Amino acid sequence: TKNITDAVAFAKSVKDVHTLVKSIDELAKAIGKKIGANGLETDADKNAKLISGAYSVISAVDTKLASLEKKVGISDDLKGKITTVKNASTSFLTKAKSKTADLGKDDVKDADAKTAIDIADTGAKDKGAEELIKLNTAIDALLTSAEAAVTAAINAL
Amino acid sequence: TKNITDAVAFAKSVKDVHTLVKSIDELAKAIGKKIGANGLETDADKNAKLISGAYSVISAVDTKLASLEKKVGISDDLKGKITTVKNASTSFLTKAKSKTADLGKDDVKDADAKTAIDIADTGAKDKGAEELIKLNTAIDALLTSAEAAVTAAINAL
Numbered sequence: 001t002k003n004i005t006d007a008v009a010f011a012k013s014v015k016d017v018h019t020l021v022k023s024i025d026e027l028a029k030a031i032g033k034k035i036g037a038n039g040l041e042t043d044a045d046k047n048a049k050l051i052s053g054a055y056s057v058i059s060a061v062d063t064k065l066a067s068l069e070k071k072v073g074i075s076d077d078l079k080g081k082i083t084t085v086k087n088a089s090t091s092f093l094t095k096a097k098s099k100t101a102d103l104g105k106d107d108v109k110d111a112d113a114k115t116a117i118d119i120a121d122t123g124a125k126d127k128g129a130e131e132l133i134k135l136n137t138a139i140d141a142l143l144t145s146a147e148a149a150v151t152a153a154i155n156a157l
Numbered sequence: 158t159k160n161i162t163d164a165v166a167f168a169k170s171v172k173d174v175h176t177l178v179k180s181i182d183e184l185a186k187a188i189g190k191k192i193g194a195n196g197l198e199t200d201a202d203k204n205a206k207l208i209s210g211a212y213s214v215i216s217a218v219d220t221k222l223a224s225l226e227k228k229v230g231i232s233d234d235l236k237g238k239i240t241t242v243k244n245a246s247t248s249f250l251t252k253a254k255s256k257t258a259d260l261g262k263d264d265v266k267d268a269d270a271k272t273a274i275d276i277a278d279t280g281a282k283d284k285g286a287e288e289l290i291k292l293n294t295a296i297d298a299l300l301t302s303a304e305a306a307v308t309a310a311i312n313a314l
Binding site for chain 1: 191196210
């Protein structure tokens with residue numbers, strides 16, 4: 001019974017991180033948008049604080065992965081997939097910090113906000129978006145492995 | 158023995174929406190903060206875009222709950238719980254839109270941002286915060302019931 005409990009718990013933790021990573025796509029939809037009377041309305045630039053929000057969500061992700069890496073009884077293969085995810089979140093944070101002049105200024109234009117947190121935009125991804133793409137790829141893989149472990153434990157019952 | 162596969166799939170969806178609601182707490186940490194060379198550093202006001210980010214996330218929570226209501230095999234008891242959460246997310250959005258003059262302006266101050274997306278706010282929660290608190294209370298309940306159902310399926314096998 002402890003086997004299914006450990007698989008479920010691990011999957012819950014990975015699902016949590018996966019959602020937070022995908023949540024950044026919801027933040028990117030707010031770039032150059034203000035809360036209007038009927039929902040989000042176009043109101044360009046001044047995106048610094050929104051990028052700060054994304055930065056905080058990815059910091060939470062990094063902290064959660066730091067905790068996951070130290071979990072006992074985890075297979076070396078799973079531990080490695082977690083590291084690939086944590087390398088990506090660490091990269092995003094380091095890159096953003098290095099781009100403070102462009103991301104922390106009083107008027108961060110829409111295009112520049114996209115180079116940080118918009119993976120779908122057809123522009124440059126030189127202020128964190130490239131790292132965010134890798135983070136997405138990495139978390140998708142860890143979620144798949146975590147969900148497969150849940151199914152295998154459910155099979156053994 | 159169908160219960161277990163469909164109970165895992167439901168708890169997955171509730172966990173997704175749950176993490177999204179808690180993600181607002183992470184966005185609240187970025188209020189009056191810019192991305193500095195060593196992480197988030199103090200730089201007050203100009204929070205409009207961050208609140209828009211939080212709006213986008215709760216908008217995603219509302220849509221996912223709407224989809225969850227139309228789910229197959231969803232009993233009446235559970236549907237009532239889902240509806241209680243959606244009413245709360247809808248209320249947050251309505252309140253945010255109605256406060257567009259305070260939340261979509263050029264300089265949303267730290268205190269005004271907290272009245273919208275900070276549940277710990279010792280001030281007035283008059284621009285979305287109270288609605289977000291009730292949303293938090295409702296989603297915790299739905300996740301508790303979804304995670305209990307998961308445990309009942311496992312114990313049955």
